[PDB]
Design a binder for this molecule. Structure first.
Ligand SMILES: [Mg+2]
Length: 1026
DNA sequence: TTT
């Protein structure tokens, strides 16, 4: 996996659409919508933890997400509540699955614990979680200054409806409001198809979808918070890429109605497969589904009155036409996997396949009555889903009452289909629980119905099969497998609940009501005390307010869908976070250039964008004339502000200082580089690279200080200079950006912290006293002697052999050293796991790589010798190679030893041994003078304001360097001082930003003397003490 | 809940 198949697909068909970015590349947002069931799953059962632990970790998760994304206006976190029957059927399927998969995996314990099905609403678990969560919001917002300008909304298991859909509802409600901002930048947590489709159908302009790369789980690889990156999808581009795909639907010289088109595309996306209906065998993404629905639609389009999905409502005639068209696809799928006048033969065999299918797999006779009710229920289904999205739930009771899908060929007279579902109401937690849980998890229910789950007398015993069969329509994985069970009739079920209900325990009786969502807002006025809750410590005073809002204060009742295209919004202007391909006249074509967006090269086609040859003559003097020294926007459509510092040609090149000659070789090389990037990753094709432009990316606003006189404010550019083809330069666009300081004193208030950049105490803590130069008091502190520790390390660094040397000492082939020292999978792992060549990793002091050659330390060698001594035949195998019990034996022998306990790290990073760490720690132990001075303003770091380019060291950071923290860094408060014990580079795997492509950021495993002991920290938040 |  790594990422959903849908995400993967549309992400490769439109290369510019998605990226893997780090904390700082994520665009600014007003609203973050966080969906919790995923998280709760990650934290509860990835081995043992108690509730306290779990909650603590969930809380953490949230904290780090909010910390990294910094939603400026709203933070809506939404836990799945009691959902409509349509979903509940599937929820139930997944429960039964997990229960049985659970028993099966516990069976390995027979060969030789936290029930997860409690992640559903109504369970004592989820309730306790709800509590702890409100408590958490209250603490965080009440204490943390960063959660105080935000508005926060929680929607718990209390409030009914899928998290993702409660989010949706709040969004539509939002659009409804009068003085609502059409430009609000929405960020939604998640990558699966449903959330893409969802955000895409809100018809919101600045909407991003994102999820972290690695669950926070790989913390056994020591990753700083700031090091974590996100996969993100830009809906704004998705739109433009569809506008590109259906260009053939244009009949005149003018844009198609994108609202109209998006709607229909939402429809296709729903056809590919959704939760609330069985999937059509003939439509899987890997199976080229989207392209097929595209072809079908395009080729059918001139015939429909207009849209199949009009503003969330279906056009049964047009629908009909479409499905009719899909018949081809379906029949072709049949013709393909059949074996696992010709046509006529095909059709007879296919009709026979139908009959036999209805009979065998549908357990129903093929009466035309059957086709009838199948068509009925299917069309009903579709409309139901569209309502779910465009207008909110329109039926809590309704559900597709079959386990399989109709035959497209057998869908005629759709138009005659009557659609009528009724709202009804969401089930009470216990009802839904009994509807969803399998016999296995009876415990999660109150005692009152345990009997109902497990006593074969039970009226509902049918719905609780000890054994349930599973059909897999050519779907490979057990999870894709259909789960053949009954469908609960609400009647009989509530009938079999009547007696028990009264007898429920008091607290059980109380926890069985639906509930509201809560709105937290930081208050200056003290709101009183809060009790503690495992694991949140108690609070003497709250500084926030919690306020109940019910499901119906968010309700929008109208004939049309508010999921319309707000016209107040500005799509002419550029917003920094959000790319558009609009500002450049370009042609386009769908080609087969094998673009590389993820790990490996795409196997299918993509859309190549081709900017039209610009009007500016492609000469040096001409390009310079226009753009030299000017402020432009490069990268496209992922635009950035930048200033042109040089223009170059294979022959010559212009600086502010005049024209000179240029290295042809180096130029042609740069050009190759650019070409490769754009085509292979960006699916972009410029006319030519005859003339390059070299820019500096905008790097923050800078405040200059003018003598004793005044405060100046200017633009700040970058350190590094990157090259961009002159053909992709876009100039003079207007942008929507957006609190200046006033007095010098306003900048430097009394008692605020100041850091020194002047030689006498480069890196000294300080405090401003009087803005007159500036009056300041510096707190001088001693610095530990590290020469000793350095010395220790140098000798250890000496302890290293070469791959060959090591081959000789162990008397083994080079190959066998290769397999032995890496990871070798047997089917289970049996490699000492010291090096990870493909990954580009190395294990601590054991392995290390320099001249593209490997070197192993002594611990490594004694280890490898050990392995050899003990397990010879295995080695013999490694050497001569290109009851299942011995494996487990050595797999464990290996997993046990301590090199596993030692951190693995990326190659090119310098580390240190625990002994040296000991010496250092001892020195700091051993170590345990305010000086007033007048200091020019530009040599003072204001902790969270000053741009890091003013304090970046002219020399790369080194080990044992003495560092102090300026910029705030998650756990570590500013001011904390320490010494470097690690230096770790980091490069983006596949940057879509040409500027980032080979940029390496530096993190430092730092030993702060104070406990707060050790943390990786970006070089940006550091000064070195001179 | 995801794959
Ligand atoms: Mg969901």
């Amino acid at each position: 996996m790594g990422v959903p198949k849908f995400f993967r697909y549309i992400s490769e068909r439109y290369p510019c659409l998605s990226e893997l970015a780090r904390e700082h590349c994520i665009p600014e947002f007003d609203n973050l919508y966080l969906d919790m069931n995923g998280i709760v799953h990650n934290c509860s059962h990835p081995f043992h933890l108690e509730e306290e632990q779990i909650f603590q970790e969930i809380f953490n998760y949230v904290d780090k997400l909010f910390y990294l994304i910094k939603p400026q206006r709203l933070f809506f976190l939404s836990v799945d509540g009691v959902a409509p029957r349509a979903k509940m059927n599937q929820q139930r399927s997944r429960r039964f699955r997990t229960a049985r998969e659970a028993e099966q995996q516990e069976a390995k314990a027979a060969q030789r614990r936290f029930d997860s099905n409690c992640i559903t609403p109504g369970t004592e678990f989820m309730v306790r979680l709800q509590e702890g969560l409100r408590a958490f919001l209250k603490t965080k917002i009440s204490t943390d200054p960063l959660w105080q300008r935000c508005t926060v909304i929680l929607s718990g298991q209390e409030a009914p409806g899928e998290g993702e859909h409660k989010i949706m509802d709040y969004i539509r409600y939002m659009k409804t409001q009068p003085d609502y901002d059409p430009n609000t930048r929405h960020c939604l947590y998640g990558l699966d198809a449903a959330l893409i489709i969802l955000g895409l159908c809100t018809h919101e302009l600045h909407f991003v979808v994102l999820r972290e790369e690695v669950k926070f789980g790989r913390n056994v690889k020591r990753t700083s918070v700031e090091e974590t990156r996100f996969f993100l999808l830009h809906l704004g581009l998705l739109r433009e890429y569809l506008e590109l795909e259906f260009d053939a639907l244009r009949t005149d010289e003018h844009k198609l109605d994108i609202a109209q088109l998006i709607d229909d595309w939402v429809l296709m996306g729903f056809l590919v497969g959704n939760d609330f209906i069985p999937h059509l065998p003939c439509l899987h993404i890997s199976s080229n589904a989207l392209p097929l629905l595209y072809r079908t639609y395009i080729g059918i389009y001139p015939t429909l009155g207009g849209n199949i999905n009009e503003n969330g409502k279906l056009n049964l005639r047009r629908l009909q036409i479409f499905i009719s068209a899909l018949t081809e696809v379906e029949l072709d799928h049949f013709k393909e996997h059949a074996d696992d006048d010709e046509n006529a033969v095909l059709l007879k065999e296919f009709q026979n396949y139908k009959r036999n299918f209805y009979r065998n797999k549908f357990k129903r006779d093929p009466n035309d009555e059957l086709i009838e009710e199948l068509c009925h229920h299917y069309v009903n289904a579709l409309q139901w889903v569209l309502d779910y999205y465009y207008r909110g739930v329109q039926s809590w009771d309704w559900y597709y009452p079959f386990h399989y899908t109709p035959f497209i060929s057998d869908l005629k007279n759709i138009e005659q289909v009557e659609i009528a579902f009724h709202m009804g109401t969401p089930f009470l937690p216990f009802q839904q629980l009994l509807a969803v849980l399998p016999a296995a998890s009876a415990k999660l229910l109150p005692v009152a119905y345990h009997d109902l789950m497990l006593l074969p007398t039970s009226p509902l015993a049918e719905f609780y099969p000890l054994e349930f069969e599973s059909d897999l329509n050519g779907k490979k994985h057990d999870w894709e497998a259909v789960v053949l069970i009954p469908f609960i009739d609400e009647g009989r079920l509530l009938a079999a609940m009547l007696p028990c209900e009264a007898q429920l325990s008091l607290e059980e009786r109380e926890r069985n009501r639906h509930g509201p969502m809560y709105v937290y807002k930081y208050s200056t006025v003290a709101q009183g005390p809060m009790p503690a809750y495992p694991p949140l410590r108690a609070l003497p005073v709250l500084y926030c307010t919690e306020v109940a809002k019910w499901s119906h204060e968010i309700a929008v009742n109208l004939p049309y869908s508010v999921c319309i295209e707000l016209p107040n919004a500005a799509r002419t202007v550029f917003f920094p976070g959000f790319p558009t391909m609009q500002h450049l006249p370009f042609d386009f074509e769908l080609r087969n250039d094998r673009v590389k967006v993820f790990e490996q090269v795409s196997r299918n086609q993509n859309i190549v964008l081709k900017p039209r040859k610009r009007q500016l003559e492609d000469t040096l003097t001409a390009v310079a004339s226009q753009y030299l020294g000017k402020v432009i926007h490069v990268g496209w459509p992922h635009l950035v502000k930048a200033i042109v510092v040089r223009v170059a040609t294979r022959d010559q090149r212009v600086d502010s200082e005049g024209i000179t000659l240029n290295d042809s070789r180096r130029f042609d090389s740069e050009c190759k580089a650019l070409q490769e990037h754009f085509i292979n990753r960006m699916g972009i094709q410029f006319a030519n690279y005859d003339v390059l432009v070299y820019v500096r990316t905008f790097a923050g606003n800078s405040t200059e200080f003018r003598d004793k006189g005044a405060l100046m404010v200017r633009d700040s550019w970058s350190s590094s200079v990157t090259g961009y083809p002159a053909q992709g330069v876009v100039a003079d666009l207007t942008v929507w950006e957006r609190k200046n300081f006033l007095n010098v004193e306003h900048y430097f208030p009394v008692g605020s912290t100041i850091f020194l950049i002047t030689d006498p105490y480069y890196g000294s803590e300080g405090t401003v006293q009087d803005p007159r130069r500036i009056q300041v008091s510096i707190m001088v502190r001693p610095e530990p002697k590290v020469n000793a520790a350095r010395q220790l390390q140098e000798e250890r660094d000496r302890d290293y052999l070469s791959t060959f040397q090591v081959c000789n000492l162990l008397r083994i082939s080079g190959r066998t050293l290769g397999r032995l020292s890496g990871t070798v999978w047997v089917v289970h792992n049996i490699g000492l796991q010291l090096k990870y060549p493909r990954q580009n990793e190395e294990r601590a002091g054991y392995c290390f790589r320099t001249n593209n050659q490997w070197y192993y330390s002594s611990l490594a060698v004694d280890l490898m010798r050990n392995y050899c001594q003990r397990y010879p035949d295995v080695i013999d195998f490694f050497g001569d190679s290109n009851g299942h019990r011995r494996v487990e034996e050595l797999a464990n022998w290996v997993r046990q030893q301590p090199h596993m306990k030692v951190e693995r790290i990326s190659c090119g990073s310098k580390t240190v041994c625990r002994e040296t760490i000991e010496l250092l720690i001892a020195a700091v132990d051993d170590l345990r003078k305010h000086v007033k001075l007048q200091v020019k303003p530009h040599l003072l770091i204001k902790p969270n304001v000053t741009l890091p380019d003013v304090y970046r060291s002219k020399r790369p950071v080194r080990l044992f360097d003495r560092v102090v923290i300026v910029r705030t860094i998650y756990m570590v408060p500013v001011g904390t001082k320490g010494t470097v014990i690690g230096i770790h580079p980091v490069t983006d795997p596949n940057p879509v930003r040409l500027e980032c492509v080979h940029a390496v950021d530096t993190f430092c495993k730092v030993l702060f003397d104070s406990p707060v002991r050790v943390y990786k920290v970006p070089e940006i938040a550091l000064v070195i003490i001179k």
